[PDB]
Amino acid sequence: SPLMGGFGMKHPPPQILIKNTPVPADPPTAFNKDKLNSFITQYSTGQVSVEIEWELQKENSKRWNPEIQYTSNYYKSNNVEFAVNTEGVYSEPRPIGTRYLTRNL
Amino acid sequence: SPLMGGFGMKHPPPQILIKNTPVPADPPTAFNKDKLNSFITQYSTGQVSVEIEWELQKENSKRWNPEIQYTSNYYKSNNVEFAVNTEGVYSEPRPIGTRYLTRNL
């Protein structure tokens, strides 16, 4: 189990390496055997979509004391948590764990 | 809609009136036309079970700010909320509303 947390897989999802092909600018009229180091500058754009279906294990604890949950505090503040600032920068205030429910040993 | 809250029904669930029948103690040997006011003291016991199936309307709001929820405060205290005291008396500390989720007008 990777010590930073997560899932340990012998065959994780593969890398997706993307490269935009070189297109040489204008090679000489006379032959030359070198690597043709003069390429025209360019880049790319698009979209990338990652649909990754999870499987859940619902909880059925017979606990009577109300569970402890994760909530966002109701109190007036300059910015909503997990919402963009006046300039447009998306700010995440705190790390969110995944251990909130309680299950007896 | 009953002003104390709840559901207004033209035909609510009926009353269930329970009475343990009189059993006269020992009427006289001679006839007497009165109401026979001497009954033997008694009571009853049992169990009562009320299964009342509700119907829910699940929520599908596309809100991004985390919803506001009802939780029990994580802080050391002499008694667990909604749990019995040292003597055995079940104590409910606060009234619990039913309006916590948020739905836009």
Side-chain angles (χ1 to χ4, degrees):
Chain A
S1 66
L3 306 188
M4 294 182 286
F7 310 94
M9 281 185 258
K10 209 102 172 165
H11 292 303
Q15 305 170 100
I16 309 98
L17 304 105
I18 175 166
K19 166 182 177 286
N20 51 4
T21 51
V23 294
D26 53 355
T29 304
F31 181 86
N32 214 9
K33 76 191 318 293
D34 285 329
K35 328 185 312 300
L36 201 46
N37 54 3
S38 64
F39 310 98
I40 56 179
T41 58
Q42 67 175 19
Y43 63 91
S44 309
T45 318
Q47 288 82 18
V48 62
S49 67
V50 187
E51 153 181 354
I52 173 164
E53 171 198 271
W54 315 80
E55 183 178 1
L56 313 186
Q57 188 196 350
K58 295 294 180 189
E59 61 86 20
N60 56 8
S61 68
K62 307 293 278 206
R63 174 178 154 134
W64 188 277
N65 189 350
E67 295 85 3
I68 175 172
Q69 310 261 35
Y70 171 56
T71 187
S72 67
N73 296 115
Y74 180 101
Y75 196 46
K76 61 193 177 59
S77 63
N78 272 6
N79 307 326
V80 178
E81 276 191 348
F82 298 87
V84 291
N85 210 0
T86 77
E87 309 154 352
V89 296
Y90 173 89
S91 63
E92 284 178 349
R94 78 177 69 88
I96 305 174
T98 198
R99 330 175 86 67
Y100 279 114
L101 284 192
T102 80
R103 174 161 140 171
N104 48 278
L105 272 179
Chain B
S1 66
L3 306 188
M4 294 182 286
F7 310 94
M9 281 185 258
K10 209 102 172 165
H11 292 303
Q15 305 170 100
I16 309 98
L17 304 105
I18 175 166
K19 166 182 177 286
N20 51 4
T21 51
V23 294
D26 53 355
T29 304
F31 181 86
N32 214 9
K33 76 191 318 293
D34 285 329
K35 328 185 312 300
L36 201 46
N37 54 3
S38 64
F39 310 98
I40 56 179
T41 58
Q42 67 175 19
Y43 63 91
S44 309
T45 318
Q47 288 82 18
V48 62
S49 67
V50 187
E51 153 181 354
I52 173 164
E53 171 198 271
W54 315 80
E55 183 178 1
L56 313 186
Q57 188 196 350
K58 295 294 180 189
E59 61 86 20
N60 56 8
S61 68
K62 307 293 278 206
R63 174 178 154 134
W64 188 277
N65 189 350
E67 295 85 3
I68 175 172
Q69 310 261 35
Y70 171 56
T71 187
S72 67
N73 296 115
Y74 180 101
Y75 196 46
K76 61 193 177 59
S77 63
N78 272 6
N79 307 326
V80 178
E81 276 191 348
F82 298 87
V84 291
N85 210 0
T86 77
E87 309 154 352
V89 296
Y90 173 89
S91 63
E92 284 178 349
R94 78 177 69 88
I96 305 174
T98 198
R99 330 175 86 67
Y100 279 114
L101 284 192
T102 80
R103 174 161 140 171
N104 48 278
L105 272 179

